[PDB]
Write a structure and sequence with these properties.
1 helix, binds the ligand O=C(c1cc(O)cc(F)c1)c1cc(O)c(O)c([N+](=O)[O-])c1, four-stranded antiparallel sheet, mainly beta, about 120 residues, 9 strands, signal (chains A, B, C, D), phosphoprotein (chains A, B, C, D), Immunoglobulin-like, five-stranded mixed sheet, homotetramer
């Protein structure tokens, strides 16, 4: 699994479940073409977005719909979304976990990049 | 000063100086119009981007050029940039500090919103 | 597994491997009695610290030896360690993951608390 | 002002006001001696804890009473407190800002260290 997204909730101390996640790849004309999407599981994880053949070098964007998550919990959020943009596979294919820790007025994001 | 951006370096425990910051506002036709730009000072802060009169209700995007900051230190970081997108002033005028704390493979961002 | 500790490295974008972790429980005379210890695995995780019978209600401390980790990488750290202190099981037993995301001059820590 | 502590609330996007902070210094016999204390102001900042002359080289501990902050807002948070332990001034006098960004089940902390 070359790309996994994990989302955590810092208010409740839990996985952030049912969070919508959309992934894009930058096109040659600098626009964002859709690539994959899903919703986080009960563990806060979204697996199966891509395959190693399809996940070529490129610039990728992961947009996490944080606003809808907080609205569903009845909590006022600051951000419209949380976006993570990164160049992938520049030194060979890697396994990427993009993690985000959400609070209503703040988020943290990190990448765990491992070599299979 | 209705909008201030502050950037910190979590590796050195310092302000992140000379970081380029570009601010955009969403126009009525859903495109991103350039709104203001600048670079962080020796304190890691960027003041003077806008005025109370100009900073009307809207959806704003703050793009922080984190990649160039790390590259100038010899580091190839994970993220292309850090973007913060938020609705401003929808309950009346507020003062916003948008802060980002940078590491090569992670960042955190928070908003401090006050009512003068 | 009632208690797991996970440690990530925000500089390298990786699990933080071989990090020493010590766990204590607060004694009746308000001193910290040793409870368990280990080192993080190649996945940054430390499992098997306790059992559900032994992990009774109480105040627990997890001390993560961040300074030794950064020294082993040749990077100057700020903190002596990262400590997490929390009351456990106050509403019944839970499964706790204590996670820490490390940078040389900053860390983040969160708890993911789930009900089996 | 050689030591300043700043506390922010990631739920409301605000300073964390009236947070108690206690500072200790490690004595030659390895015990923690009380050094200074105070509470955060309306800006979330606590100034005036020490002076350049008194703030000698040593190992310092800053304990932030995060639990009482959340409890006064009706919340039972995960952590009992947030502690930050660090060696100060070992390369000569520096100015330290110790910041903490609080959520009910998570916190981040960073140090900004400057040379006047
Ligand atoms: O990114 C993080 C993370 C972010 C922070 O701000 C603070 C922190 F302690 C961890 C993370 C990544 C993972 O892969 C993961 O499993 C977990 N977890 O389970 O708790 C967390
Ligand atoms: O956003 C933060 C911040 C982010 C984190 O991950 C952890 C933390 F403790 C603070 C911040 C904001 C500010 O306005 C500010 O002055 C400072 N500071 O000087 O240190 C920091």
């Amino acid at each position: 699994c070359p790309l996994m997204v994990k989302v955590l909730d810092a208010v409740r101390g839990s996985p952030a479940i049912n969070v919508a996640v959309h992934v894009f790849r930058k096109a040659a004309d600098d626009t964002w073409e859709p690539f994959a999407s899903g919703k986080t599981s009960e563990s806060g994880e979204l697996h199966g977005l891509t395959t190693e053949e399809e996940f070529v070098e490129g610039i990728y964007k992961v947009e996490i719909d944080t606003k809808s998550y907080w609205k569903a919990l009845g909590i006022s959020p600051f951000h419209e979304h949380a976006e993570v943009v990164f160049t992938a596979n520049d030194s060979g294919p890697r396994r990427y976990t993009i993690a985000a820790l959400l609070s209503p007025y703040s988020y943290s994001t990190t990448a765990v990049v491992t070599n299979p």
